[PDB]
Amino acid sequence: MNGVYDVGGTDGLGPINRPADEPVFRAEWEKVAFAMFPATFRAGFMGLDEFRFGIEQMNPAEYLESPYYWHWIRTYIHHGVRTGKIDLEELERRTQYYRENPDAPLPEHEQKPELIEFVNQAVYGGLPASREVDRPPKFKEGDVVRFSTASPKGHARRARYVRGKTGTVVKHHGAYIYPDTAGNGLGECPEHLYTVRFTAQELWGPEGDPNSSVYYDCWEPYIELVDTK
Amino acid sequence: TENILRKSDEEIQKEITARVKALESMLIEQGILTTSMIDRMAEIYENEVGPHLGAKVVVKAWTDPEFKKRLLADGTEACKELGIGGLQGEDMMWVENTDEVHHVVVCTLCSCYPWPVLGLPPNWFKEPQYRSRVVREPRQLLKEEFGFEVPPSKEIKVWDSSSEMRFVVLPQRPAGTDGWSEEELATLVTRESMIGVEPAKAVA
Ligand SMILES: [Co+2]
């Protein structure tokens, strides 16, 4: 979708805020927000692409200025409601309860060894998105290609600043989970993945830096030939 | 930046805290979230996984030309030689700074970052200011925000991680470090140097 989150090339967002040092987690709620990703992932709320799409659907004013891990909370709720695993009225009720009683206990629960095993395995083992497909790569290093001007309403990885632009294939990485299906609940449907080089002048016009380029990763349907050798 | 519509930071923190505790209570009752799971995730990225791991990779590449070739050929498989890898670094591609090229990495669409070598990203990396501007004016951004002057003749390559490929900058080895040990060289390697927003530390 063409959301505000797609900020590459956007002007006017202001100076970078960069404290001299900062903790990994600024508050306890951030640790909880963070750990909820493997928990909701394991429980089938969403996969990685769907996770991103939930955030992309935030109120943009809220997105632009809220603490980062609040984005994560919004997407858990989004998918919780989407899948019927979270009752929103109960959540609103509990929110007010902990508003009035911030030190009230969490619900009694059993610890689960398998959740710790899941965590360690995901962290050190990873969650690889690479896949084998039956088709060979359509493109190769050196191919001059043009990025699609499609503007899907659903999830995609088509930054507005590269749409319709011409660049050069730099590397074929193999095939990967395709965001345009996966982020919309339509499955992995893997596609070959390429890094494509776009000059700053191509991206930003004839006043652009003549000695700068942006490298952007494109799934196969994103790009079509202009020329080959 | 001033927003006359915005609540105070304290009031925002209070509201978020209640919201998150409520959601937490519900996921706990579903049996899919536990306090030990939360504590483990937090411990891993506070204390086990961080930029000291990337630094070890960098100094090995600095001191081992064959490893460096492997690193630049297949980043994930090379880092595994050091027991480094995993979540959000399943597909790493390392890019080498030289006298002719400077690399800088961004996720314009969100926050993508190579967790297994750098740990979780600092908040400025994830925020709209850096993400919007670095693909558009990298040279000015590096100078204005990071005090880093890249000569206009020197090519700047911005890597936007729109896929699960994770890009990591191999910073140039600082002058004056001939024959330094790996542990001594590691002191020069920063998370910023592997994002590309700064060079590795000068010896001074
Ligand atoms: Co991202």
Q: Are B115 and B92 in contact (CB under 8 A)?
A: no
Reply yes or no on whether B79 is catalytic.
Answer: no
Dist CA A10 CA A160 (whole Å)? 10
Domain containing A73 equals 1-126
Q: How far is the CA of B181 from the centre of ligand 1 (A)?
A: 35
Answer with the one of A107, A126, A145 that is the final residue of a domain: A126
CATH of the domain at B186: 3.90.330.10
Q: In whole angstroms, give the CA distance from residue A157 to residue A49.
A: 10
Contact predicate A180/A154, CB 8 Å: yes
Residue with tokens 């669409």: B109
CB A163 within 8 A of CB A149: yes
Three-state DSSP at A49 gives helix
Give me the number of domains chain B comprises: 1
| Whole-angstrom distance, CA of residue A161 vs CA of residue B82 | 38
DSSP label at A161?
Answer: G
Range of the domain at B105: 1-204
Structural domain count, chain A: 2
Q: Let me know: does A126 contact A148? Beta carbons within 8 Å.
A: no
Whether B79 has a binding-site annotation, put simply, is no
Contact predicate A3/A57, CB 8 Å: yes
Which of the listed residues A126, A157, A173 is the one where a domain comes to its end?
A126
Residue A67 forms contact with B (CB below 8 Å): yes
Which of A126, A147, A173 is where one domain is finished?
A: A126
Experimental technique behind these coordinates: X-ray
Cα separation, A60 vs A66, in Å, equals 10
Q: How far apart are the first and last CA of chain A?
A: 33
CB B85 to CB A126 under 8 A? yes
Tokens 């591609």 identify what position? B93
Residues A38 and A89 in one domain: yes
User: Could you say which residues from 17 to 36 on chain A have a Cβ atom under 8 Å away from some Cβ of chain B?
Assistant: 17-18, 22, 24-29, 31-36
* Phi, psi values for residue B46, rounded to 5°: -85, -30
Cα A226 to Cα A142, A145, A146, A159, B53, distances in angstroms: 11, 5, 7, 20, 42
Rounded distance from Cα A46 to ligand 1 centre (Å): 16
CA B168 to CA B85: how far, in whole Å? 13
